[PDB]
A paper describes a structure:
For this, a C-terminally truncated version of CK1δ (1-294, tCK1δ) together with 29d and 29e, respectively, were used in co-crystallization trials. Crystals suitable for diffraction analysis grew in presence of both compounds in crystallization conditions containing 0.1 M MES (pH = 5.5), 10% polyethylengylcol (PEG) 4000 and 0.2 M Li2SO4. These crystals diffracted to a resolution limit of 1.8 Å and belong to the monoclinic crystal system. In each asymmetric unit, two tCK1 molecules were present with an isoxazole-based ligand bound to each ATP binding pocket. Surprisingly, the ligands in both protein-ligand complexes proved to be different from the actual target compounds submitted to co-crystallization. Since all analytical data for the originally employed inhibitors was consistent with the given structures, we postulate that the incorporation of an additional methylene group occurred via spontaneous Pictet-Spengler cyclization during crystallization. Following the discovery of new ligands as artefacts in the X-ray complexes, both these Pictet-Spengler products 31a and 31b were re-synthesized and subsequently assessed for their biological activities. In the in-vitro kinase assays both compounds exhibited nanomolar activity against CK1δ and CK1ε with a five-fold preference for CK1δ over CK1ε. The cellular assays revealed 31a and 31b to be more potent than the originally designed compounds 29d and 29e with EC50 values below 2 µM. The higher cellular potency of both compounds is in a way surprising, because in contrast to compounds 29d and 29e the chiral moieties of the Pictet-Spengler products 31a and 31b are too far away to interact with residues in the ATP binding site.
CK1δ is a Ser/Thr-specific protein kinase and is one of seven mammalian CK1 isoforms (α, β, γ1, γ2, γ3, δ and ε) within the CK1 family. All CK1 isoforms share a highly conserved kinase domain and phosphorylate a high number of substrates, including the tumor suppressor protein p53. Based on the wide spectrum of substrate proteins CK1 family members play an important role in the diverse signaling pathways that are involved in cell division, apoptosis, membrane transport, immune response and inflammation, spindle and centrosome-associated processes, DNA damage-related signal transduction and circadian rhythm. Deregulation and dysfunction of CK1 isoforms are associated with proliferative disorders, such as cancer.
Residue numbers in the entry: 3 to 18, 21 to 43, 47 to 292
């Protein structure tokens, strides 16, 4: 079974809505292939990927097209997601690994923002480690929910609006996203703050809530998230994680985040440990 007369389809390797391992027959290396039934967001997403190409940690798209009952996108092969690796590490990351990940993840989000888009679904499942020579590089994937937030030429910001439906993953959504406020740059970074504390804790305190329908469940998540102060969420971990989250929640809708300040919070903590720290992630030790 071939895709584009040139890619051999292999076994399924995930879903993000089905991801297959593939082989570039001509070049002889493996690839990742995403197939979508013609119902649609793959072609729109491919254009965003191609707008982002060249950035550090942005995957390369090898081919786009249609094959029978599927729209197809072929991407360079990447490794397991950070969720996969978190589970492999028994849902415990060392502080070193969390700080190493935080530095790269802030930079990936900054790059997307520099290209005039907001990601709007920041979660561990959308960060993948490279393979082989790129095993120390964090990649970001999935622009199916991404949105342009400013004009490319003038940088004029999209307007503030409310009554927006939740586009993303409830567990990691910002408070203002739960309130139905238009997402902006601050919300990508606030979601990352929850991801980092997720890595620190093994789970977040608004996980595991049940309800009749999705809407009621999101309301339960919203209530618990709003009633858990950052100081309680982050107790027992270096204060930098609370400082990060408080900074993100204090950003105005239109504010350009101080990415450098946020990276330096964690970089200073990392460097203060001196030689007691490596540049080796837990799963490579
Ligand atoms: C021999 O050594 C090896 C070999 C392979 C691996 C290897 C490679 C992968 C993998 O998923 N790669 C991958 C996935 C995507 C991808 C896409 C996507 C694909 C194409 C496209 F155009 C746009 C998006 N959308 O979503 C995903 C993720 C979330 C699934 C993109 C690029 N790369 N996984 C493994 C290892 N596995 C362990 C566990 O079982 C995981 O589930 C599975 C994941 C590790 C070691």
């Amino acid at each position: 079974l071939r895709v584009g007369n040139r890619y051999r389809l292999g076994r399924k390797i995930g879903s993000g809505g089905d991801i297959y391992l593939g082989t570039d027959i001509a070049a002889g290396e493996e690839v990742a292939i995403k197939l979508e039934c013609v119902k649609p967001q793959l072609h729109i997403e491919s254009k965003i990927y191609k707008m982002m190409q060249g950035g550090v940690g942005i995957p390369t798209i090898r081919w786009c097209g249609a094959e029978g009952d599927y729209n197809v996108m072929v991407m360079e092969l990447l490794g397991p997601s950070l969720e996969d690796l978190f589970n492999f590490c028994s849902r415990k990351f060392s502080l070193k690994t969390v700080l190493l990940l935080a530095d790269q993840m802030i930079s990936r989000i900054e790059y997307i923002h520099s290209k005039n888009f907001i990601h709007r679904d920041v979660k561990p499942d959308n960060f993948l480690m490279g393979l082989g020579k790129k095993g120390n590089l964090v990649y970001i994937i999935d622009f199916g929910l991404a949105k342009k937030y400013r004009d490319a030429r003038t940088h004029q910001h999209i307007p503030y609006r409310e009554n927006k439906n939740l586009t993303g993953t409830a567990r990691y959504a910002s408070i203002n996203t739960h309130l139905g406020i238009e997402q902006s740059r601050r919300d990508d970074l606030e979601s990352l703050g929850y991801v980092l504390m997720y890595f620190n804790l093994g789970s977040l305190p608004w996980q595991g809530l049940k309800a009749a329908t999705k809407r009621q469940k999101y309301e339960r998540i919203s209530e618990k998230k709003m009633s858990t102060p950052i100081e309680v969420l982050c107790k027992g971990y270096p204060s930098e994680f609370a400082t990060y989250l408080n900074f993100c929640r204090s950003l105005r809708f239109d504010d350009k985040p101080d990415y450098s300040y946020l990276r330096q919070l964690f970089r200073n903590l990392f460097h203060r440990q001196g030689f007691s720290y490596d540049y080796v992630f837990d799963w490579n030790m």
